[PDB]
Amino acid sequence: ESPSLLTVIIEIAPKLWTTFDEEGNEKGSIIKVLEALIVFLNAHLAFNSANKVAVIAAYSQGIKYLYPESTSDLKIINSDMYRRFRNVDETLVEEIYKLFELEKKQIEQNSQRSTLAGAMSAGLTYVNRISKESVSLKSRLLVLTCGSGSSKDEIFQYIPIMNCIFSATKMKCPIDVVKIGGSKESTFLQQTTDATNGVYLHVESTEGLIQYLATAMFIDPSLRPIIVKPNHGSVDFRTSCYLTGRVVAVGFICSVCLCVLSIIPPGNKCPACDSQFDEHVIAKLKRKPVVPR
Amino acid sequence: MGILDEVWKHKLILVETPDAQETSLALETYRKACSNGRGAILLSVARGKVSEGIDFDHQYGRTVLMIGIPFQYTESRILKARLEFMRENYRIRENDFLSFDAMRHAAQCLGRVLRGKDDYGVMVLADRRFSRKRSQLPKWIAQGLSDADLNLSTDMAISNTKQFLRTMAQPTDPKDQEGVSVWSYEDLIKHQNSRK
Amino acid sequence: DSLSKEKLLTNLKLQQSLLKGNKVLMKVFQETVINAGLPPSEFWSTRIPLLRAFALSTSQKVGPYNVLSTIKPVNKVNVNLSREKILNIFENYPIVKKAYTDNVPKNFKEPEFWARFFSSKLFRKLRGEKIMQNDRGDVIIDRYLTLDQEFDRKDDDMLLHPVKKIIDLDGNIQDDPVVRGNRPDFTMQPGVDINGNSDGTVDILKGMNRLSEKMIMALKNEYNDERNELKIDDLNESYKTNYAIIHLKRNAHEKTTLKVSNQQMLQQLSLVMDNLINKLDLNQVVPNNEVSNKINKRVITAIKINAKQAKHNLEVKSTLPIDLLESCRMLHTTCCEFLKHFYIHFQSGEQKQASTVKKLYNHLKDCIEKLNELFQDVLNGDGESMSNTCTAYLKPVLNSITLATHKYDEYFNEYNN
Amino acid sequence: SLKHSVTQYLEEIPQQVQNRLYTSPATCLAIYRILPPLAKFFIMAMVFNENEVPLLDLDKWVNSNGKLQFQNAIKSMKSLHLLIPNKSSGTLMINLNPTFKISLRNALTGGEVQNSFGVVVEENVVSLDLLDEYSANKWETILHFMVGTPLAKIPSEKVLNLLKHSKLMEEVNSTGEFKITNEGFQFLLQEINSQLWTLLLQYLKMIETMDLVDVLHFIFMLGALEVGKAYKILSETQRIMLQDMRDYGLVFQKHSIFYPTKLALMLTSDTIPDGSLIVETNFKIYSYSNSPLQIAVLSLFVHLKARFVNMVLGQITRESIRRALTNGITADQIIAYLETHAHPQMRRLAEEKLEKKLELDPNCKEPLQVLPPTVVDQIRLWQLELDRVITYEGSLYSDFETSQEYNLLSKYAQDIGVLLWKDDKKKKFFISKEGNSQVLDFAKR
Amino acid sequence: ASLVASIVEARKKRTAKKNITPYQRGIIRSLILTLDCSEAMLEKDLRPNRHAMIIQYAIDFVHEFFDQNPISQMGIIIMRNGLAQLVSQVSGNPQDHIDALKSIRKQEPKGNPSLQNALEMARGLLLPVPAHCTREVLIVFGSLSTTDPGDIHQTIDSLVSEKIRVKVLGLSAQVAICKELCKATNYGDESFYKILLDETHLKELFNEAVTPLPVNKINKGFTLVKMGFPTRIFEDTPTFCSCHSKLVYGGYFCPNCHSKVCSLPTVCPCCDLMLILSTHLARSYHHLMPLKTFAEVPTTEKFRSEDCFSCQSRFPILLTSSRYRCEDCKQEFCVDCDVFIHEILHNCPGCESKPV
Amino acid sequence: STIGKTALGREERENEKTLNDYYAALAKKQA
Numbered sequence A: 001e002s003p004s005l006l007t008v009i010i011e012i013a014p015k016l017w018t019t020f021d022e023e024g025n026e027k028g029s030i031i032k033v034l035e036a037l038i039v040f041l042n043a044h045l046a047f048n049s050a051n052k053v054a055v056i057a058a059y060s061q062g063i064k065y066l067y068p069e070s071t072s073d074l075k076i077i078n079s080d081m082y083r084r085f086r087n088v089d090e091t092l093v094e095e096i097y098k099l100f101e102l103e104k105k106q107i108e109q110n111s112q113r114s115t116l117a118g119a120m121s122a123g124l125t126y127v128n129r130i131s132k133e134s135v136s137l138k139s140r141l142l143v144l145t146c147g148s149g150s151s152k153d154e155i156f157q158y159i160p161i162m163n164c165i166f167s168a169t170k171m172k173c174p175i176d177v178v179k180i181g182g183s184k185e186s187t188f189l190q191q192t193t194d195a196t197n198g199v200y201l202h203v204e205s206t207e208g209l210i211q212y213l214a215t216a217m218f219i220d221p222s223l224r225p226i227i228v229k230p231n232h233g234s235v236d237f238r239t240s241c242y243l244t245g246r247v248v249a250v251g252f253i254c255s256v257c258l259c260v261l262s263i264i265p266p267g268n269k270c271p272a273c274d275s276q277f278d279e280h281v282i283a284k285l286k287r288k289p290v291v292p293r
Numbered sequence B: 001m002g003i004l005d006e007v008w009k010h011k012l013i014l015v016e017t018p019d020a021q022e023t024s025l026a027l028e029t030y031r032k033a034c035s036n037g038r039g040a041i042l043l044s045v046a047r048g049k050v051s052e053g054i055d056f057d058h059q060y061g062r063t064v065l066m067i068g069i070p071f072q073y074t075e076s077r078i079l080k081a082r083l084e085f086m087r088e089n090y091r092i093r094e095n096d097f098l099s100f101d102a103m104r105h106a107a108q109c110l111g112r113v114l115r116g117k118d119d120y121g122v123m124v125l126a127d128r129r130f131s132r133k134r135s136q137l138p139k140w141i142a143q144g145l146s147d148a149d150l151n152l153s154t155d156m157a158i159s160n161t162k163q164f165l166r167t168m169a170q171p172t173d174p175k176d177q178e179g180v181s182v183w184s185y186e187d188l189i190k191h192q193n194s195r196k
Numbered sequence C: 001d002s003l004s005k006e007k008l009l010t011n012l013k014l015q016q017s018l019l020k021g022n023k024v025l026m027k028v029f030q031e032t033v034i035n036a037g038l039p040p041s042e043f044w045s046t047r048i049p050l051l052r053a054f055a056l057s058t059s060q061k062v063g064p065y066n067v068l069s070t071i072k073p074v075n076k077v078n079v080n081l082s083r084e085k086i087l088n089i090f091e092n093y094p095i096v097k098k099a100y101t102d103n104v105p106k107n108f109k110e111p112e113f114w115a116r117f118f119s120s121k122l123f124r125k126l127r128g129e130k131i132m133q134n135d136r137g138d139v140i141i142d143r144y145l146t147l148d149q150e151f152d153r154k155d156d157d158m159l160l161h162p163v164k165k166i167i168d169l170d171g172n173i174q175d176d177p178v179v180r181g182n183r184p185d186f187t188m189q190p191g192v193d194i195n196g197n198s199d200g201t202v203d204i205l206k207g208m209n210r211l212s213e214k215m216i217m218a219l220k221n222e223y224n225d226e227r228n229e230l231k232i233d234d235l236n237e238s239y240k241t242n243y244a245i246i247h248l249k250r251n252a253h254e255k256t257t258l259k260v261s262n263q264q265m266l267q268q269l270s271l272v273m274d275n276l277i278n279k280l281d282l283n284q285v286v287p288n289n290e291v292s293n294k295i296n297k298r299v300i301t302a303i304k305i306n307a308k309q310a311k312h313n314l315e316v317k318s319t320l321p322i323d324l325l326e327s328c329r330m331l332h333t334t335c336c337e338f339l340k341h342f343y344i345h346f347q348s349g350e351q352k353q354a355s356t357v358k359k360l361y362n363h364l365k366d367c368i369e370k371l372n373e374l375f376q377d378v379l380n381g382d383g384e385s386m387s388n389t390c391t392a393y394l395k396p397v398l399n400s401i402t403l404a405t406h407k408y409d410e411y412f413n414e415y416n417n
Numbered sequence D: 001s002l003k004h005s006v007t008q009y010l011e012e013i014p015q016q017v018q019n020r021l022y023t024s025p026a027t028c029l030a031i032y033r034i035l036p037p038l039a040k041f042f043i044m045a046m047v048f049n050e051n052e053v054p055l056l057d058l059d060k061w062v063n064s065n066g067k068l069q070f071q072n073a074i075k076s077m078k079s080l081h082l083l084i085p086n087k088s089s090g091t092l093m094i095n096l097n098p099t100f101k102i103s104l105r106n107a108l109t110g111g112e113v114q115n116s117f118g119v120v121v122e123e124n125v126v127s128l129d130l131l132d133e134y135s136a137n138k139w140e141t142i143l144h145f146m147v148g149t150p151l152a153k154i155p156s157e158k159v160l161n162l163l164k165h166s167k168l169m170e171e172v173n174s175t176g177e178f179k180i181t182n183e184g185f186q187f188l189l190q191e192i193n194s195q196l197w198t199l200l201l202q203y204l205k206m207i208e209t210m211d212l213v214d215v216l217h218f219i220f221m222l223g224a225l226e227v228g229k230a231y232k233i234l235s236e237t238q239r240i241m242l243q244d245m246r247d248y249g250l251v252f253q254k255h256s257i258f259y260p261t262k263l264a265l266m267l268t269s270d271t272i273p274d275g276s277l278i279v280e281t282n283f284k285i286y287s288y289s290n291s292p293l294q295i296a297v298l299s300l301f302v303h304l305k306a307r308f309v310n311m312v313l314g315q316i317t318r319e320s321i322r323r324a325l326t327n328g329i330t331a332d333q334i335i336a337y338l339e340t341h342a343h344p345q346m347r348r349l350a351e352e353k354l355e356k357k358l359e360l361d362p363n364c365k366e367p368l369q370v371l372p373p374t375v376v377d378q379i380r381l382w383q384l385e386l387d388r389v390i391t392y393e394g395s396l397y398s399d400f401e402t403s404q405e406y407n408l409l410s411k412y413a414q415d416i417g418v419l420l421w422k423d424d425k426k427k428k429f430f431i432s433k434e435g436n437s438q439v440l441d442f443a444k445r
Numbered sequence E: 001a002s003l004v005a006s007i008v009e010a011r012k013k014r015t016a017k018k019n020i021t022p023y024q025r026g027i028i029r030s031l032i033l034t035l036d037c038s039e040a041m042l043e044k045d046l047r048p049n050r051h052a053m054i055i056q057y058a059i060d061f062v063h064e065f066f067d068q069n070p071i072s073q074m075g076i077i078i079m080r081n082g083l084a085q086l087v088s089q090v091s092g093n094p095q096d097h098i099d100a101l102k103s104i105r106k107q108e109p110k111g112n113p114s115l116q117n118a119l120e121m122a123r124g125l126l127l128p129v130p131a132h133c134t135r136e137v138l139i140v141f142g143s144l145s146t147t148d149p150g151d152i153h154q155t156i157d158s159l160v161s162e163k164i165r166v167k168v169l170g171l172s173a174q175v176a177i178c179k180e181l182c183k184a185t186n187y188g189d190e191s192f193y194k195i196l197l198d199e200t201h202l203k204e205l206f207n208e209a210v211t212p213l214p215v216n217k218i219n220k221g222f223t224l225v226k227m228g229f230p231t232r233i234f235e236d237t238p239t240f241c242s243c244h245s246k247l248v249y250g251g252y253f254c255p256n257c258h259s260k261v262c263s264l265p266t267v268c269p270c271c272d273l274m275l276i277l278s279t280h281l282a283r284s285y286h287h288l289m290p291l292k293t294f295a296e297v298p299t300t301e302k303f304r305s306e307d308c309f310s311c312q313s314r315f316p317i318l319l320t321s322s323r324y325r326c327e328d329c330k331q332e333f334c335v336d337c338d339v340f341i342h343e344i345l346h347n348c349p350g351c352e353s354k355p356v
Numbered sequence F: 001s002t003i004g005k006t007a008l009g010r011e012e013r014e015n016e017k018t019l020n021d022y023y024a025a026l027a028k029k030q031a
């Protein structure tokens, strides 16, 4: 009914995609998702003539805005493509080429953490700027992540993703997630989709991605209330402990810092805020249930 | 007329009496009512026992209504003789001395409102004859008396009082008084160095 | 004092007061206390706050104020009075109460008493108005005028006390006891008449002063300093906040229930670069028609479940009859109340409540039996048509009750034997 | 109304012509955008899969709340024959048109397009200086000739003929002059997008034997093109069609290469104010507008007295109002123009008036009247004055032998809705000239 | 010089924002909102009237407070006819309080206010609260006089003994007893007694009251609270809820007694266990790890990029550099972003993107 | 604006009862 902005955040990392190719029998599967995303963006632009497109790539050493251009060309797609569609696709491919060159130069750099949270925050900031500038535009976030590569530690991603969830809920900006890899579910991203009215999808095979993109992640903000989401997974809205690394259904959270704990911390002292708990108070919770003698 | 009935709804009424003990108890009651937030109004004589030492600061004194110039009784033989003696000896005019005597008590009552620089109050002189006595008020009161307030109306004075109280109810900026009205040891040393 | 857990639980009058007014609380109470047999103290233990709120509603009174001044008579004149104002008048003027109690049942009724009081000079004197000799007043009320004088003397003695030297005006006049000067002019002395006696205007001033003093003193009922007052606060050191700072360290272990090298990574990167520069076919995105059907089947498989949940995501309309539904709700409510009490006593942590825990466990077992009996009754009456629906309606509470009993049994097995 | 009008015209076209119309991806890209959002979603779902999906599966996607929207979407999609319903094996399978599917696939995936969108000469021109000025001037000339204000360069015989043959701009040779009508005023009240679409639709209906599919190919491709760039020259009919379109100020020719203009992009989708005016209780109008088009259209129902650079001042008079009404303009349309061109001062004062009304009586939500009710009352009263005298053409029936026959004839006339007046006491009645023949035939029978 | 005046005013505004420290704040709050409904509230200084504007802003405050403090609780008291009337019991349901305010807005205010009565009622309402929660009372006072039956100083002493904290928002002028209350009840701090100057400043004060108050160093109540995270259930048939005894399509299952609850966060009606979701706790992490302020870069030095890092927007070119940087990551940000990252978001995109 | 108009011219009671009876029984039991 009204124009909507689509901000696609793609987590393209050589380490992430090499593991996918090695575990599978598909070589260069990254290209497949590139052209699948290109056709998806063309379809989004064909939905209406007043809708914009933004692409943010999260590479090893940071983030980059593939579209629109920064601070103001090779032929990779036929020039017969629609002028508006090509104006975005050619720039996207050129920035992909430049990004690959830049990251190839620093391939030896030891990056121990991903940048998906920063990419999501940048996308939200871009949505805010465009909405404030133009006046009466809807917005939508898409996150294409490669989960095949084993992650080092996802704990540090918890807080920023939750803040992004809150901001998206304030701006009524659904965020959808598409995961390509081995793990069937990503707890944090699935929580993001469920709490922001998004769509969480996990696909094992890179081929035929356009079907999923067109049938599942094509719900524009105008008809979200009238379209039922295809998500199948169910979340628990739980969090892992702080010193045992297990999901806790019932536990103790420190009042001062609201840090979760499955069991009483050793030494009767919080391991995060260095706060000493009262012995008399802590004994009460340690007391066992009452049963007749 | 029933005006005291209207006053009673908003504040308690305490009245100065000839009995010194009763007046002291009235002062204590007025202070208690001002402290507990009930709100109180104290009626006294400008040349009475309260104005000769009792001080109203902070919560105790907020508004001072000087109802008329506290002129002495002109038709008094003692005062007339004193005026004649002063005119003959010190060459002081009778009107000048009478105005001085009244303005002195008016200022005496006015000055019992402020203890420090964080205290505030509204001082209304209700008489047509104060309009020409600005030059006779103390210097620190004359400087604060603006030219637009020389002759006001009751409603306009009420509006000004409301605005002034609302303005004075805000937190003061520390920088606005850091070294211009309140001096620390370093500021005092700087003043001494600049002066020397 | 009185507003405490023990007294609120023991004040049966308050319990009978709020429950008579509140119907829903009575709805639960009738089932859980009359037929079920739950102790009233146990019932109110979890509703302490309701009792305190209902008590505070009626346990508060307005502050003292000048009522006779608010009384405006406004030829006939109509003056309106209310019970609250009558009580305020009695509280503020004990003489009126004295003349009321001894005369209302004896000589004349309350309306006549109030009319005579309003017409009398006593009301004028208590209003702080100058009494006029021309006014006739009332003969009956005037008998108390001298008693009012005596009461005023007694109240003056009640209020008199030593005053601090800071605001001691008596010391100001007694500082020099041998002062002899010129007597003040008549403008500086109380007004007097031709005959030389007082005009009476000072009396009303003293009356209003005494009224204010009495109100302030009544505030202070049964229910060093000079240095602090005289010190200049503005010149003191500015107040400094004493808030505590916190530094939150972040170090948490990962959740608990092939490696690729730089050469392979660079080789794949070179491959993708070469492919992109050489050629790119967007038409290859279209599937082969052998995987499109599978993808569509998977997506529609998810869609069916999502729609089934979404079509049914004021109480919702129900198929059961009103009587049976109400009975089911009653059973659920009583069972839930028993469960709440059982869990409270079980997790109290003190063994002194073992008898209460046992009684609540027996009550829960009886609740299970009652649920089974209701299921059987509905099964036979409705021929299984509504039995399944009722069981679905009451399924979670049955599971909770049986879980509580199972946990109690397991812990008893471990503890006792 | 934009999408509704275009969709209605496209629906009236035969299916045989639609199938050939969907050959070029350029036309498909334009037609796709006009459908409702739900229809667009379904079309995008169906385009990328080469299979048949049952209608029930599509129904599952829509929530209970949007069930109504599902009906409109499916009805609109089926009206254009875009979705071909095939029933077999007891299931009402739904499939997409193969030509439409292939066209969308080519457009989206950059497949073979046969240069439907055209080529680029890489010889750009100054759009602001030349394209904007040319199109603005030409559109202004046509609109000026429509509003009737004198203008030197009269429009070409092509557009003049289209105007006359259309309901717009009624003309009579006996009178020897051209005047605006009710539809003309509505056209002038419509926005630029709808103003262009109306003329283009009239041209589409006017053209006879130049293919209907070719005309839509050219129009939709023109909408596809972007302003400020060159495009080398196409169909044989499209050559003369391009020359004709140059007469509407859409495409600019040097005198080999044609350039689209701002209106070309305006065709595809949409995109103090000029035109806002103040109306006083003294029947005075002060319009803060500087444009001959606005001045001329205001002159229709305003007795202009003077003008300034920044604004135009006039007075409402019975003569001007009667002129506008005689031209067929409705008071509703006049008040619509005034309301949609109300000044911010008038809007703020009317908002304060509504706020005061609701504050005084918030129980009733009174309507928001931007301009004083007296002007509305006066205009409607003048319309009533014009409508005071009512006359009909027909014949009077009397001298009936039998009351039964009189009642029979009068009742038949009432049943066929051609009875205007009757009197039983006089046994007389009057019927319309249209129904005179039917009444006479019934009387004979 | 007007543009430079605007720039210097912006710098002065940022001066206060410069000083930010990770103060310890009590996320778990128990607030008692006391409203004044007396004859003094019939004045027209606030349009249409004080009662109407105050009630509207109270509704908005309730919405914001329960949006940003999911695990807190609120209660509503009013002052009418010199008596304190309770209109909302302490609970975690925002809808009940909103409906209570919608009911309150109708009745005309009359009578005198009673601060002592209101404070006693608030103390009684806050008596049954855990020691780990912060007991707060927000009063909207409009009158210049107080009529009380007892000694207000004794009530103030009792409040100090009970460790309750009182914030007072005045309308016209400072009241001595209000100042003494707000000072003695906040360890001598005198910044908790605010008098508004206009409608916009009243809105700003109401919004400021939302954020949790920092705790005192000497007031230690550190402890561990037993809470559980339930799992949402999707059922085919309606079932009776253990909290309201009403049929609902689905509800969260407690992990300690398996009873179902309609909405979160609420104390379980059976095991008296607090049920919350991870997002409810996540909403308060920014109060424990506030983002450090951003300082503008002087024009003397050389800038990094011509476009904003977070939004990719051209930096306006003209005297004063329109750039803001994050010291942690040293990434230039535009003025439009800075406010968004410091008001809506709570993470720096540059810091998140920088690997370690 | 009246232009189009034609021109002017010529039960809880039992619940309370059982409540009272039960409380009377309670009081008698305590006494």
Ligand SMILES: [Zn+2]
Pocket: A254, A255, A256, A257, A258, A259, A270, A271, A272, A273, A274, A275
């Ligand atoms: Zn901690």
Ligand SMILES: [Zn+2]
Pocket: E241, E242, E243, E244, E245, E246, E248, E261, E262
């Ligand atoms: Zn419920």
Ligand SMILES: [Zn+2]
Pocket: E254, E255, E256, E257, E258, E259, E268, E269, E270, E271, E272, E273
């Ligand atoms: Zn539970």
Ligand SMILES: [Zn+2]
Pocket: E326, E327, E328, E329, E330, E331, E348, E349, E350, E351
């Ligand atoms: Zn940073």
Ligand SMILES: [Zn+2]
Pocket: E308, E309, E310, E311, E312, E313, E333, E334, E335, E336, E337
């Ligand atoms: Zn920016």
